[PDB]
Amino acid sequence: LQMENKAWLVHRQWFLDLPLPWLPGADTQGSNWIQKETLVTFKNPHAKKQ
Amino acid sequence: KHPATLRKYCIEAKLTNTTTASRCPTQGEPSLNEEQDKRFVCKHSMVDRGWGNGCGLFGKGGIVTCAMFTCKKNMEGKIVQPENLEYTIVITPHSGEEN
Amino acid sequence: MRCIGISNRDFVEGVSGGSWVDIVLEHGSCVTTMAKNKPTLDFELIKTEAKHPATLRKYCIEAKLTNTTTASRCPTQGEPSLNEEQDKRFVCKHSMVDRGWGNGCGLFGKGGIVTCAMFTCKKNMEGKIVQPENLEYTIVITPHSGEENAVGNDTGKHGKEIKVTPQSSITEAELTGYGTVTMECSPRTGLDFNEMVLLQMENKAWLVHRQWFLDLPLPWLPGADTQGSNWIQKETLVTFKNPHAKKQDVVVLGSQEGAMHTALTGATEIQMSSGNLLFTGHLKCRLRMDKLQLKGMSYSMCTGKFKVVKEIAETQHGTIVIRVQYEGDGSPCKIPFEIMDLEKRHVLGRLITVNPIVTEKDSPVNIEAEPPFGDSYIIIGVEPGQLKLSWFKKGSSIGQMFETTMRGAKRMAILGDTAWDFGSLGGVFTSIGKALHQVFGAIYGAAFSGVSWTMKILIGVVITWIGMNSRSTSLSVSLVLVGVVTLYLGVMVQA
Amino acid sequence: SVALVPHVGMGLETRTETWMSSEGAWKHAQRIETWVLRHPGFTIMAAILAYTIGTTYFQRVLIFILLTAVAPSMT
Amino acid sequence: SVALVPHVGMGLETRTETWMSSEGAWKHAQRIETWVLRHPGFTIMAAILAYTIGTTYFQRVLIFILLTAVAPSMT
Ligand SMILES: *[C@@H]1O[C@H](CO)[C@@H](O)[C@H](O)[C@H]1NC(C)=O
Ligand SMILES: *[C@@H]1O[C@H](CO)[C@@H](O)[C@H](O)[C@H]1NC(C)=O
Ligand SMILES: *[C@@H]1O[C@H](CO)[C@@H](O)[C@H](O)[C@H]1NC(C)=O
């Protein structure tokens, strides 16, 4: 696991269980992130707007 | 050696093109053309609707809002085949001397 | 007319002796108040504002480390010294490394080592406070005038706006044609602003708890700081690594914006970008009906023919709204509106838009009523030519009673004892209930503060079981009641 | 981490929706479910321990639930 | 969030110091202590409930510890 010039050795199931959006790995353009809902929040205070 | 990525996670993103579709009560959930788009993140909710909203039925009108998800920072998850490891070992004898 | 169309709408009926009614004005909802011979009014709290907030503390959420330096000493010779240890902008740590002949020591023990790096903060999480005195509340009063565009119209061009502040206890709004309405609000007793923080982080704000905020584990500054470099709890945003007891290094430990966003779960968002606006919370006001006089009273009844310009629509609360136009000679007249039974011998439905009037011949007055459950006729106009519209209201009296009970319970869940002020008109029972609620709510809030809804559900289940397996009838019933209330609250908490 | 000290039980909740109420309503229960699925072995041993300690099924079930809920938490 | 699944009991551990091992060792217990100090009311209720439920003193202490450990974290 490499993150901004820092790398860790981690369990593979743990890595695959992370709640962040991910790309397949061969993806070369982004644009198909999977769990995009984990990195966004939809707010509907009352029932006026979303 | 020769790591292969199996997943690239997003640790920081941004949303750019927000759009909303609204539908009057009992008309079903609305649809945005960008729900088919995989680079957009979408959600279906309900808002109060009535004459004041230019609707005419006074109920919970479904609403859908979408935005474009763009990753600004990711963390690679490279994997390596067990055959590609290389352990380096130093064997030094107690010669009592120096290099 | 502004409340028509809002899901969180409350009907308050009647005024105490002395013609005042006590109502609570929550954000996102609104209250319609009706009293005999008094106009029907729509009250909505549309804005809370905090003025001149004071910074209480600045948290660091993203830092950087530079000018890293280390000092070593041979074993048993004490601690190493670093000139940067004197400065508090440097985060430092002492540790032991293996020393020996190989690395220049005559001894073979654990030598002390000190690593110092300069801590610089890049992003802030400022948390501000407001005195309850600078707490401008904004209320919009719209009468049920029946105007064509009045229904559900949030533009507020046809509704009076009154600003409530602790400086003046009494607010007067002149409603053109309806006299003057007097609200005596309690801006000091709403959100306890001396126990909350206006937390602002990167173009977002949250209304958080003062103690929770002061308990945040991050580097911070006292709030009056000007140099902004003597961060205090810096060790919470830095890592000291001594991997193999050989070399010690320091890393800055990432950016905590997302971690804070997750931490702020359960905190209502606010707008501090410009003005520190709040669109959450309530405001308890006492309404004065004394000077409210029906508009269009002292008018002759409309004898001409009416037409329906917008079919009857049923709102979410069992009240229909229809728009009718007039074609007759006595333009400024009062509309003959009635809700009868199918035989036309009993008046079943009450008019929410009490005393509708045709101000203009060409202007389509719209009016709201509450028809009875089942079939009924909406008669508009006098006999010569008169509209007779059939309506069916779905539901029941038992269902309405259940829904009213559930709504009252929910109001008691969001509000504490303040739910006993929502529609109170004096009343010894109301006061006693509010006092018992105050005591029980104190006990409950003490016993359940800082717990999630799942834990509340678990505790409620446990207490209900304990009561069910009690051999004392009084204690059994009390425990079952407490457990059921706890379960209900856990189900209803959050958001 | 700050993320381990959320603002949930502070008792300031109004009728207005909170920061991540929809998302965070079931996040902890989802985490417990996922952990219990990925680590069945601790579930069996926690059940055995609760059954042994608990003299009555109420005590046993409560102990098992608390153990299973707390194991992923510290984890 | 990701911070709630902190890669602890995964094996893979060695002599080499792990990441954030000095702090994460005790930060959970520090957090529970701070919560118990900041919310005395719940701890009293937890003790009372554990006493009511626990037949023996072992069961009561175990239940109380589990309850007070899961109360803040379950949040
Ligand atoms: C998104 O918005 C930008 C404007 O910033 C525009 O140039 C672009 O075409 C839009 N993309 C869409 C709507 O897919
Ligand atoms: C609300 O009022 C404005 C001005 O009074 C008017 O232009 C509008 O048509 C009305 N109805 C709305 C906005 O639905
Ligand atoms: C830290 O290093 C920078 C160079 O990157 C230098 O300009 C600055 O004066 C140094 N500060 C101290 C306190 O030594």
Polypeptide structure, described:
This is part of a larger assembly, with three copies of chain A and two copies of chain D (75 residues). Chain A is low in regular secondary structure. Chain A contains one helix and one strand, in the order αβ. Chain A is elongated. Chain D has four helices and no strands. The two termini of chain D are 14 Å apart. Chain D has one domain. The longest helix of chain D has 18 residues. In chain D, 64% of the residues lie in helices and 0% in strands. Chains in contact: A-B, A-C, A-D, A-E, B-C, C-D, C-E, D-E. At the C-D interface, strand 14, helix 2 and helix 5 of C face helix 1 and helix 4 of D. One 2-acetamido-2-deoxy-beta-D-glucopyranose binds next to loops of chain B.
Please provide a brief summary of the model.
With 50 residues, chain A is low in regular secondary structure. Chain A is 10% helix and 4% strand. Chain A contains one helix and one strand; from the N terminus they run H-E.
